[PDB]
């Protein structure tokens, strides 16, 4: 639960993010990637992936980092009301591809990491914790969802 305040300061940080989408996605990945290497096990589209190097000219991971923070974008900026937007993405992770709640922990800590070297001493304090409320709120009605199905 995030106040209008809040939800101000998480949609104002998000700008950042939608000037340059697809290099925030990347590093984003990349940061997941090199960070906790049992996540790059998930894809099968990214597991040929050996060094950074590789993971940094990949074109469809840049591609796959759009999708990603594009979906998390939309979620965002329904501020709490996102049943519908959660709901396909936790049972896809649950069912499909199998993603441990963990790893969603993995991926919020990126977020908070990629914004402060993205945009170092302009990633207030105000606004690191209020970007952090809204992806625990995120991850919680995952988590939530997960329960339901039985997913560990
Ligand atoms: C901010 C959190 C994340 C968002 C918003 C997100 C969003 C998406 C979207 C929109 C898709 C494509 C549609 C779908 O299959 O449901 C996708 C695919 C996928 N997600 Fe996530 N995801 C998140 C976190 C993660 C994490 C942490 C992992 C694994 C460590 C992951 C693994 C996958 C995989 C394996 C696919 C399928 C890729 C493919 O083969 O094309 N996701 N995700």
Redesign the pocket.
Same mark, same amino acid.
């Given at each position: 639960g995030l106040s209008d305040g809040e939800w101000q300061q998480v949609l104002n940080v998000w700008g950042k993010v939608e000037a340059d989408i697809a290099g925030h996605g990347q590093e984003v990945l990349i940061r997941?990637f090199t960070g906790?290497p049992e +996540?790059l096990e &998930?894809?099968? &589209?990214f597991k040929h992936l050996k060094t950074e190097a590789e993971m940094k000219a990949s074109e469809d991971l840049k591609k !796959?980092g759009t999708?990603? =923070? +594009?979906?998390?974008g939309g979620?965002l900026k329904k501020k709490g009301h996102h049943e519908a937007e959660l709901k396909?993405?936790a049972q896809?992770?649950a069912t &499909? !591809?199998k993603?441990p709640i963990k790893? =969603?922990e993995?991926?919020?800590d990126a977020?908070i990491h990629v914004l402060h070297s993205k945009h170092p001493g302009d990633f207030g304090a105000d606004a690191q914790g209020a970007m952090t409320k809204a =992806?625990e709120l995120?991850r919680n009605d995952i988590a939530a969802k997960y329960k339901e199905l039985g997913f560990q």
């Open positions: 997941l906790h +996540t &998930k894809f099968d &589209k !796959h999708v990603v =923070l +594009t979906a998390l979620i396909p993405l896809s992770h &499909k !591809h993603i790893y =969603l993995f991926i919020s977020i =992806l995120f």
